[PDB]
Amino acid sequence: MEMGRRIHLELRNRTPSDVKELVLDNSRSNEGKLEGLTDEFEELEFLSTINVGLTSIANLPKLNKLKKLELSDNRVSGGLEVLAEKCPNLTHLNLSGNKIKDLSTIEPLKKLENLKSLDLFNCEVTNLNDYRENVFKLLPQLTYLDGYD
C-alpha cells in the first residue's frame, strides 16, 4: 500500500499536530521520495519509514520535535545535510541497510548537535579499516554506534 494512504490509515482521524509517533514501515514511497509528510507534524517525536523504497530524503519537512528517525532497509545514499536543517533535535538515527558508502556521506551529520546514537548495520562504510574509530573521530558528539560503547 501507498505511503500517503498509509499515513492516513495510521492517523485514524487525529489531526497531524496531535501525533507523537508515526510508523509507515513497508508502505510505498512515491518513487523513492516521502509523500504526505508535512511541517504540520509539529509534535512528531518518532518517525519510522523502514523498507519503503526511499532513494532520497531531500523532501523532509520541518520537524522540530523529532527525536528518533528510523530509515532502515532503504536505498538512501546522500543529502544527509537535510537532517540538521529539518530536524535539528535528532538524538537517534537508524540508517542500517542503506547505501551509505563512505565517511564523506555521513559527515553532514556533525551538524546534528544532539545526535547520541547512530546505526549503520550492513552499510558499505562498515567495511572500513578502523571503521568505529573513524566514525567517532568524525562525529565526536556520538556516544553509541551500532549498539555499542
Swiss-Prot record:
Biological-process GO terms, alphabetical: intracellular signal transduction; nucleocytoplasmic transport; regulation of apoptotic process
UniProt LRR repeat ranges: 18-38, 43-64, 65-87, 89-110
GO molecular function, one term: RNA binding
Record PTM text: Phosphorylated on serine residues, at least in part by casein kinase 2/CK2.
Phosphoserine modifications at: S17
Phosphothreonine sites (modified residues): T15
Keywords: Cytoplasm, Endoplasmic reticulum, Host-virus interaction, Leucine-rich repeat, Nucleus, Phosphoprotein, Repeat, Repressor, Transcription, Transcription regulation
Superkingdom to which the source organism belongs: Eukaryota
The UniProt record lists the keyword Repressor: yes
Tissue: Expressed in all tissues tested. Highly expressed in kidney and skeletal muscle, moderate levels of expression in brain, placenta and pancreas, and weakly expressed in lung. Found in all regions of the brain examined (amygdala, caudate nucleus, corpus callosum, hippocampus and thalamus), with highest levels in amygdala.
Compartment annotation: Nucleus; Cytoplasm; Endoplasmic reticulum
GO-annotated cellular components: cytoplasm; endoplasmic reticulum; nucleoplasm; nucleus; perinuclear region of cytoplasm
Domain LRRCT: 123-149
Subunit comment: Component of the SET complex, composed of at least ANP32A, APEX1, HMGB2, NME1, SET and TREX1. Directly interacts with SET. Interacts with ATXN1/SCA1. Interacts with MAP1B. Interacts with ELAVL1. Part of the INHAT (inhibitor of histone acetyltransferases) complex. Interacts with E4F1.
Function: Multifunctional protein that is involved in the regulation of many processes including tumor suppression, apoptosis, cell cycle progression or transcription. Promotes apoptosis by favouring the activation of caspase-9/CASP9 and allowing apoptosome formation. In addition, plays a role in the modulation of histone acetylation and transcription as part of the INHAT (inhibitor of histone acetyltransferases) complex. Inhibits the histone-acetyltranferase activity of EP300/CREBBP (CREB-binding protein) and EP300/CREBBP-associated factor by histone masking.
Family to which this protein belongs: Belongs to the ANP32 family.
Protein name: Acidic leucine-rich nuclear phosphoprotein 32 family member A
Name of the gene this protein is made from: ANP32A
